[PDB]
Amino acid sequence: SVAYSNNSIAIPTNFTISVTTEILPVSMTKTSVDCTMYICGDSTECSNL
Amino acid sequence: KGIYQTSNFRVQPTESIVRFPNITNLCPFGEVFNATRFASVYAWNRKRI
Numbered sequence: 001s002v003a004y005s006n007n008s009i010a011i012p013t014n015f016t017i018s019v020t021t022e023i024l025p026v027s028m029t030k031t032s033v034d035c036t037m038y039i040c041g042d043s044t045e046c047s048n049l
Numbered sequence: 050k051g052i053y054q055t056s057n058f059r060v061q062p063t064e065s066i067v068r069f070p071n072i073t074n075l076c077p078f079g080e081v082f083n084a085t086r087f088a089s090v091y092a093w094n095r096k097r098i
């Protein structure tokens with residue numbers, strides 16, 4: 001609770017130089033997919049289908 | 050102009066091999082199919098091969 005009154009003010013007499021950390025992602029992994037190898041592998045019949 | 054992703058590197062098989070167990074006897078087709086007496090359906094016969 002802050003002591004609000006009609007004719008009172010609070011003015012600082014000192015200060016602090018504070019340093020904080022902040023982390024933000026910028027990028028993600030780049031991936032590629034080979035359909036034939038994932039779905040069929042080395043199966044020529046599946047590759048034809 | 051640019052760089053394009055193509056299919057992954059493939060190595061084609063050179064030869065073919067088969068590996069089966071050391072089996073020399075022939076299956077007894079002459080005592081399962083050519084029997085002189087068969088079993089009834091209520092007491093059918095089961096033979097291990």
Ligand SMILES: *[C@@H]1O[C@H](CO)[C@@H](O[C@@H]2O[C@H](CO)[C@@H](O)[C@H](O)[C@H]2NC(C)=O)[C@H](O)[C@H]1NC(C)=O
Pocket residue numbers: 003004
């Ligand atoms: C500025 O004045 C206010 C009001 O008198 C003060 O606020 C009170 O502080 C006392 C002592 O800590 C507490 O018991 C009260 O609960 C507060 N509320 C009231 C009565 O308003 C405040 O502490 C003063 N600030 C300074 C830096 O002296």
